[PDB]
Write a protein that binds this ligand. Structure first.
Ligand SMILES: Cc1cc2nc3c(=O)[nH]c(=O)nc-3n(C[C@H](O)[C@H](O)[C@H](O)COP(=O)(O)OP(=O)(O)OC[C@H]3O[C@@H](n4cnc5c(N)ncnc54)[C@H](O)[C@@H]3O)c2cc1C
Ligand SMILES: Cc1cc2nc3c(=O)[nH]c(=O)nc-3n(C[C@H](O)[C@H](O)[C@H](O)COP(=O)(O)OP(=O)(O)OC[C@H]3O[C@@H](n4cnc5c(N)ncnc54)[C@H](O)[C@@H]3O)c2cc1C
Lengths: 484, 487
């Protein structure tokens, strides 16, 4: 009757939910394991995982800050007079606020254990010795000191992901999303490498807090940033990001990064262009973090990219060993991991097998301006259904006629299965779109039809009401090809 | 084979909707009649209607303008340094800017007629001679130069509403929302008389652009502003208004208003209190604007309060005449008047009988901070279902711990029918709820249950994701009686 009922490796978004539920809801013994208790170097992530410490939380507070640059600017057309040459962003001011917030969350996790019978935190690098033995080492090195040895019935593997670096000269002269949250002073020239949402988000941040005259370059290997999202929106976002002074460089890649005497980095892109930046941030991708778990010793299977393989119930090949969150590489979002976390408990300790629904999952890119997208892109629906119709709507809010940011188009695009009119995807660009897409997502959960949207009376005046006034498909895709 | 197929009195939200659909989609001979083709004195509303000219549109631009007061202020917390002492609102700019907006919209309206065969505009005060003849006169005066006589098959009265006045001494010294859209300089002290959204929205605009050391007091007869909304939301909104400087004087009504030497209005309240203000805005009510239509001539039934009586399909007792919008007094909102008018066009010119649903109609209050609500408030559900559940959630967004606007609590309350868990009312208080509630209306309209909500994966970090996290009711009502638990 093993020392522990559950030993969760990773006190992240999914692993903490599992742990708390099992302990608080089903009187189980739970050892949770993470590398540190408070946010920040050397591990950046800590109890609460990547989201609280170096993810969604500080990222959003910071994107909130970055926004004032536009509002203060836009306030002009509405009659607000102020000494505008006197406006000066304070990065230190900001960072200290963020730190105060994230540490506040960290502190609440600590009291969460002194209130839960059975829930136990354990600091250190977890790794497996055998399918019931979870070693806690003082380090990531395989033969490093073994602090603990927890004997357990089931083992959940929720160790998140981690920034990806490129194999170039000067890779170590670049920072990643992790460091960026602790920059002492905001870069004047910064280079964001990557077209993902993490990179698009931080460029928008670096561009609001740059010294007058500064520059923010976003270099991405391919042709269009934000691969995976609606292509029509991808183009639109590129134009407005550029409109805010961000230099979008598609088809660029650092080739060799070097340090200038003054400490700034000199970059030579593959294209043959070079340029200097105070900061060069690497937002290439996040890889499943499994490597030092010694999954081999447990028998547990992994993919080629390091993703632990799990089925619908996030069960690995070994019956008592489960894996959730980003480590499993399904949908790397906080809510998804939390659902996978809550379901694993239903399944193994409540005997009511449930599997998380990774379809119709809402998400937002807090770029400036942001996106809130849910579901399929015409491309995937088009290779999935006989015929799909696509609706499109775009307009520049009146207020933007008045504020000056007239490049700020609101854009709603809808994808349906034309056979029965069921909504497969919703994609919006423009302010509030992360707020709006949340209720759009319940609709799609309930399988709403385009007729269900257009039949609802709108709330006016709102960007949202645009969703209820799309009755005609712009064009279609029939048996996989564009039509009409 | 009659002069026109349709004569629409009122070129508004419903009015223009019906006009264009009937013409542009059924090739009917449509004549649209409005007092003026441009926003402003002397009529205020004009082509486009009340929403476009002196309502939703200008109001939303004036509240966006007013939000900057808070925004500029909260940027301090996120590290934005600037000459704070240099910040001054400039009403005249808001007003030029706003005017420029509306005009563009009015300008586009004329081209609508120019490019629509069968659609024609007619300027003046439409009056009824008889159920097939519409007199387009010179004024409201029955003894007005009859500018033209329209012969018609169907008549659609869609004249909207108008601000309701009090009959107190000096009522004539006060303004209404029609005038405030044209104020010359932002009032420094202002009285907003009314509990409704129009009044609450204006107190927010005045409070933001007011000269410093200034003050906006909001007086309402009832006990709590916004009669008709979720009781908790009203209460919380009240706190948040006080917290921002507005003086919510509940149980206060003006007894009389006189003019001071200096042009300011002095007011004595029924309670005996007195104060002086540069402006007194009455935003106590709006009444169906049917009085100068001579509905008697065509035999149209009208309720006590001027509301034109109509059935589910908008038809009046007079088979060839339909009434839509604020004038019928159903749900006085622009979207409703619009859905209503599209429906008429089918019913009458497409023989496809439609009746607008005035239920599960989401709407919003553009106060600061704003509200977005859709559905039954608990009280009402309580009278219609033996067991109603009430889940409530409130929190202060983390950004507001950093901004300083710590009083800013996002509040969500859901009333469900506890038997089957059907969601009957979703109500919010907080930034973005006007946007977030629009899709909840789609949900509630599709018959959503509370599991549908909490079973949806959340978007994080957002305010809306709270909707998907309310799985446990906070209290119930059993056969009209609130109880802490079902027994
Ligand atoms: C910059 C950034 C912004 C993001 N923004 C968003 C957003 O806005 N919204 C959103 O929904 N998602 C966002 N995400 C992603 C989101 O944070 C993740 O999807 C989510 O955190 C995944 O949770 P998880 O359960 O996989 O584990 P994580 O939350 O990543 O937690 C993993 C934990 O395990 C610990 N761990 C690692 N190795 C070991 C070990 N050997 N032993 C013990 N413990 C270990 C880690 O230190 C960490 O604490 C963002 C991510 C990043 C990086
Ligand atoms: C300050 C304010 C803010 C508002 N904000 C909102 C909001 O945010 N959202 C919302 O949904 N609703 C809002 N409303 C209400 C909304 O404007 C109305 O519900 C809507 O305009 C009603 O449309 P309608 O078709 O009934 O007529 P209206 O749009 O009022 O149009 C009626 C038209 O008929 C004309 N008319 C009247 N009498 C005659 C006559 N005898 N002869 C000829 N023409 C005539 C008038 O000139 C007017 O142009 C607001 C109203 C006000 C006053």
């Amino acid at each position: 009757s093993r020392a522990y009922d559950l030993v969760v490796i990773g006190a992240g978004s999914g692993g903490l939910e599992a742990g708390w539920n099992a302990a608080s809801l089903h009187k189980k013994r739970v050892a949770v394991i993470d590398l540190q208790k408070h946010h920040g170097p050397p591990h950046y992530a800590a109890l609460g995982g990547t989201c609280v410490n170096v993810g969604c939380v500080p990222k959003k507070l910071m994107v909130t800050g970055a926004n004032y640059m536009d509002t203060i600017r836009e306030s002009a057309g509405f009659g607000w007079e102020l000494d505008r040459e006197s406006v000066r962003p304070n990065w230190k001011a900001l960072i200290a606020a963020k730190n105060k917030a994230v540490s506040g969350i960290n502190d609440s996790y600590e009291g969460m254990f002194a209130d839960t019978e059975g829930l136990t935190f354990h600091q250190g690098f977890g790794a497996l010795q055998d399918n019931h033995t979870v070693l806690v080492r003082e380090s990531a090195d395989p033969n490093s000191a073994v602090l603990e040895t927890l004997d357990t019935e089931y083992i959940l593997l929720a160790t998140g992901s981690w920034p990806q670096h490129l194999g170039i000269e000067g890779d170590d002269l670049c920072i990643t999303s992790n460091e960026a949250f602790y920059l002492d002073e905001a870069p004047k020239r910064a280079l964001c490498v990557g077209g993902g949402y993490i990179s698009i988000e931080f460029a928008g941040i670096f561009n609001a807090y740059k010294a007058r005259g500064g520059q923010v370059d976003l270099a991405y290997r391919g042709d269009m940033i934000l691969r995976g999202f609606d292509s029509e929106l991808r183009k639109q976002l590129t134009e407005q990001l550029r409109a805010n002074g961000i230099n979008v460089r598609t088809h660029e890649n650092p080739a060799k990064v070097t340090k200038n005497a003054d400490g700034t980095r000199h970059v030579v892109f593959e294209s043959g262009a070079e340029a200097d930046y105070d900061v060069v941030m690497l937002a290439i991708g996040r890889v499943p973090r499994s490597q030092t778990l010694q999954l081999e010793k447990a028998g547990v299977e992994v993919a080629k990219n390091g993703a632990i393989k799990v089925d619908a119930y996030s069960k690995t090949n070994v019956d008592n060993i489960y894996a959730i969150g980003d480590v499993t590489d399904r949908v790397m979002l906080t809510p998804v991991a939390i659902n996978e976390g809550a379901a694993f408990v239903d399944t193994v300790f409540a005997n009511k097998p449930r599997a998380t629904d990774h379809t119709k999952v809402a998400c937002a890119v807090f770029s400036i301006p942001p996106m809130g997208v849910c579901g399929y892109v015409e491309e995937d629906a088009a290779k999935k259904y006989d015929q799909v119709a696509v609706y499109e709507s775009s307009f520049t809010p009146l207020m933007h006629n008045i504020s000056g940011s007239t490049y700020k188009k609101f854009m709603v695009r809808i994808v349906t299965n034309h056979a029965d009119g069921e909504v497969l995807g919703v994609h919006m660009l423009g302010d509030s779109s992360p707020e709006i897409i949340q209720s759009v997502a319940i609709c799609l959960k309930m399988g709403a039809k385009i007729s269900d949207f257009y039949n609802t009376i709108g709330v006016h005046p709102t960007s949202a009401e645009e969703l209820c006034s799309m009755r005609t498909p712009a064009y279609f895709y029939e048996k996989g090809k564009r039509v009409e």
